[PDB]
Amino acid sequence: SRRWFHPNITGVEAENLLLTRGVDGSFLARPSKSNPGDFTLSVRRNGAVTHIKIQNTGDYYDLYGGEKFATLAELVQYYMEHHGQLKEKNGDVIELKYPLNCADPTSERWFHGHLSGKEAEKLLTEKGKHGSFLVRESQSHPGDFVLSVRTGDDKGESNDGKSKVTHVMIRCQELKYDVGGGERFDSLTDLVEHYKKNPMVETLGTVLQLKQPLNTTRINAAEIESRVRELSKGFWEEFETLQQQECKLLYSRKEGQRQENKNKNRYKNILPFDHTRVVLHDGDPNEPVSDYINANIIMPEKKSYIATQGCLQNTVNDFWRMVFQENSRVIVMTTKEVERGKSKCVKYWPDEYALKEYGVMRVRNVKESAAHDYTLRELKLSKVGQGNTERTVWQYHFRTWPDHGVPSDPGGVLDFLEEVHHKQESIMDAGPVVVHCSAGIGRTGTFIVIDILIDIIREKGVDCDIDVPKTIQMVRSQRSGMVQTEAQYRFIYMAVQHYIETLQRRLEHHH
Numbered sequence: 214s215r216r217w218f219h220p221n222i223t224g225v226e227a228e229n230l231l232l233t234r235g236v237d238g239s240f241l242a243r244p245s246k247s248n249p250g251d252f253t254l255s256v257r258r259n260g261a262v263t264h265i266k267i268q269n270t271g272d273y274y275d276l277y278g279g280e281k282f283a284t285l286a287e288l289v290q291y292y293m294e295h296h297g298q299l300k301e302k303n304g305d306v307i308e309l310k311y312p313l314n315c316a317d318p319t320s321e322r323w324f325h326g327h328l329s330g331k332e333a334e335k336l337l338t339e340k341g342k343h344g345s346f347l348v349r350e351s352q353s354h355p356g357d358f359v360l361s362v363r364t365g366d367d368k369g370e371s372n373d374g375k376s377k378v379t380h381v382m383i384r385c386q387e388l389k390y391d392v393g394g395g396e397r398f399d400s401l402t403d404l405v406e407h408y409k410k411n412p413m414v415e416t417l418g419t420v421l422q423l424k425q426p427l428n429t430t431r432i433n434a435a436e437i438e439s440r441v442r443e444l445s446k447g448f449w450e451e452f453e454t455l456q457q458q459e460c461k462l463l464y465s466r467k468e469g470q471r472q473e474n475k476n477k478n479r480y481k482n483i484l485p486f487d488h489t490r491v492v493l494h495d496g497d498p499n500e501p502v503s504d505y506i507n508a509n510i511i512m513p514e515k516k517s518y519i520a521t522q523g524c525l526q527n528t529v530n531d532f533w534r535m536v537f538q539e540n541s542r543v544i545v546m547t548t549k550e551v552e553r554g555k556s557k558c559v560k561y562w563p564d565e566y567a568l569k570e571y572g573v574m575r576v577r578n579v580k581e582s583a584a585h586d587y588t589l590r591e592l593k594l595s596k597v598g599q600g601n602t603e604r605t606v607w608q609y610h611f612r613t614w615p616d617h618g619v620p621s622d623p624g625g626v627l628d629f630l631e632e633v634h635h636k637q638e639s640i641m642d643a644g645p646v647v648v649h650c651s652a653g654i655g656r657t658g659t660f661i662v663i664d665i666l667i668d669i670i671r672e673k674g675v676d677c678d679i680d681v682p683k684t685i686q687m688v689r690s691q692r693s694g695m696v697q698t699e700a701q702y703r704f705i706y707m708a709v710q711h712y713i714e715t716l717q718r719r720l721e722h723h724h
């Protein structure tokens with residue numbers, strides 16, 4: 214689980230907790246109160262506490278005096294299975310041995326805090342199904358909580374009486390929680406987990422199975438403006454609830470962790486999941502391992518994507534092997550080659566009108582066209598020795614994304630993605646759209662999620678269901694950490710709103 218993240222704790226509270234309820238090797242992580250994208254790892258050692266800063270401006274989590282990570286949970290797993298790996302400024306070793314668990318329930322999907330019983334019934338009546346549940350505050354008994362559960366036959370329709378809502382009072386007595394007998398638990402989370410595993414039964418047989426929380430994030434796309442107004446007064450709480458679910462996604466990354474593959478990775482701990490990695494065939498027999506690239510297939514769940522990193526000097530040939538094998542006809546690039554004086558994506562294309570060989574692959578730059586926010590390069594890709602393999606690959610290079618943060622208006626991103634979409638759709642049997650640069654998780658995830666959400670509205674028009682955090686979770690299950698920050702999360706909502714709003718202007722302008 215992810216109980217070592219404390220969403221609402223001050224530095225002084227962090228110290229107190231470690232000193233009175235922890236030991237040497239106890240740790241926790243907390244967000245900074247004022248400056249978002251800043252986090253702190255607090256750790257006890259030698260009877261004192263040290264605080265280690267973690268920064269995220271949109272590309273990765275950067276731990277001072279340590280490494281860069283795709284998620285906070287991947288960071289914690291790495292140092293809990295690797296001792297003496299984290300070092301102080303002095304040079305000494307910092308051990309993360311014992312998570313210090315949080316009781317606060319405000320980031321759990323099942324917690325509704327403020328709710329009443331009839332409101333909860335109508336919610337579960339309308340949006341909920343067999344085994345749907347929530348926890349809420351009591352109105353008769355101050356300090357207590359209530360667990361509310363729908364059960365019965367989902368097959369049924371109409372108001373037949375084949376389903377019901379059951380309410381179970383939860384008492385809180387000196388910092389512990391219980392359902393009126395048996396075991397006393399240290400947090401609501403512990404209590405919910407236990408009765409999720411060991412469901413309560415009623416005197417007459419009904420089993421109160423806790424199968425899934427109630428969904429409160431799905432909206433009709435035409436109501437986007439109302440949700441955004443409401444989240445603006447919010448976006449942080451919804452984001453951090455989504456982040457709590459990242460512990461479910463620690464899938465294996467063994468092929469990336471192999472010796473033979475180590476210097477094919479921009480950052481050594483940001484790696485592709487095994488189950489979705491792009492596998493390269495037809496390699497050099499002599500090369501020991503010719504089948505690896507730091508890239509994943511992203512399938513929405515008819516257009517698919519490949520999310521990948523900026524090339525290294527020694528992976529440019531592999532990048533073109535991938536584009537050729539997968540039959541990709543469109544590449545999206547989300548960084549300048551250089552930002553803040555550091556290399557972000559190596560130049561892997563020829564100058565305009567020039568021609569270059571990259572291993573067995575040949576590329577001609579036919580023509581570049583400059584737009585306000587991007588440059589388009591018309592490339593032709595073929596295998597050396599075989600003329601009939603030539604196909605056009607169109608490269609869309611987004612150039613105006615800010616060095617830190619996100620753009621303050623989404624129009625340029627949306628016009629860009631609309632043009633990428635029409636090109637892709639013009640080409641019979643095109644393979645997946647390649648999206649990259651930097652570590653290939655932050656901007657890359659943001660552009661893919663926006664594209665997925667807009668495509669639904671392109672198909673089904675302005676009245677249809679969208680669910681931003683649920684989409685991000687499904688994409689995060691196919692590459693680590695897709696969408697990095699609160700500001701990117703907000704930006705996604707704003708882009709959908711802008712899209713909906715222009716689409717309604719067609720109808721206004723018509724009448």
Ligand SMILES: Clc1ccc(-c2cc[nH]n2)cc1
Pocket residue numbers: 322429430450451452454455458682683686
């Ligand atoms: Cl799959 C999923 C993950 C997270 C949420 C959520 C609900 C409130 N915030 N985030 C909803 C669905």
